[PDB]
């Protein structure tokens with residue numbers, strides 16, 4: 703029943719699991735995400751999301767199967783997917799300076815992926831369960847060979863099920879650096895689940911800024927730095943982030959010279975709307991995808 707897999711190299715580490723490059727005898731290269739028994743609930747959450755036939759999309763990591771693997775001293779829970787050699791976006795931007803064409807491809811594919819995740823329908827019209835990521839960041843966005851993005855790392859994700867209770871939506875997850883000001887404030891408007899989609903758009907705005915910051919179309923490009931890199935610790939707490947994002951209304955810097963390029967100007971204007979203090983003022987991911995198609 704178990705696939706003939708040989709693990710090769712540890713390539714990543716997520717919040718709940720380690721990620722390995724592996725060989726699948728058929729040999730095809732695959733990614734194997736390994737969850738220890740104590741993170742079973744996160745393995746089950748990701749398995750449930752990936753098992754929905756309505757999720758499959760070019761900008762969502764291609765899922766193969768889930769497995770339970772007995773070890774000599776316990777049991778592991780695996781998820782096996784396609785492997786993207788270029789790896790995660792944070793590392794890609796750290797190592798590379800990207801072109802305007804690259805930024806267009808990466809930014810538009812990220813917006814299309816989030817719009818699909820949030821959608822209550824498939825691209826054809828069938829009802830689909832909307833999903834909110836809740837921990838979107840450059841380190842868990844994958845770069846495909848054709849320089850388009852694909853999403854993964856759904857352990858904190860929420861299926862927007864009509865059965866969700868108010869006492870269930872209110873029980874501060876995710877990466878502090880990428881938390882929207884209402885998340886840092888514990889001020890999410892729980893009267894509508896649309897509040898959760900708005901938090902993903904904020905995090906997406908920070909990632910679009912990271913991509914823009916490494917785009918040679920502006921001319922002189924600085925070495926990559928995470929959003930708020932010089933303002934807070936390497937692993938900042940919610941309090942230090944709230945000092946910046948909420949109290950100081952702080953956002954990553956957009957130097958005026960970047961706006962000299964017509965394309966960069968449009969991207970900067972769009973991502974600025976997406977990181978507005980007011981979640982209701984942000985554009986939707988679908989709006990952002992449309993803005994990119996207009997370029």
Ligand SMILES: COc1ccc(-c2c(-c3ccnc(NC(C)=O)c3)[nH]c3cccnc23)cn1
Pocket residue numbers: 713714715716717721733734735748752763765781782783784785786787788789790841842844854855
């Ligand atoms: C459902 O199963 C999976 C399996 C792997 C990942 C996954 C990968 C991943 C995927 C494909 N190719 C690569 N390739 C290189 C070079 O890293 C890395 N990177 C991650 C970083 C954080 C969390 N999850 C991941 C996510 N879900």
Ligand SMILES: [Mg+2]
Pocket residue numbers: 740
């Ligand atoms: Mg635990």
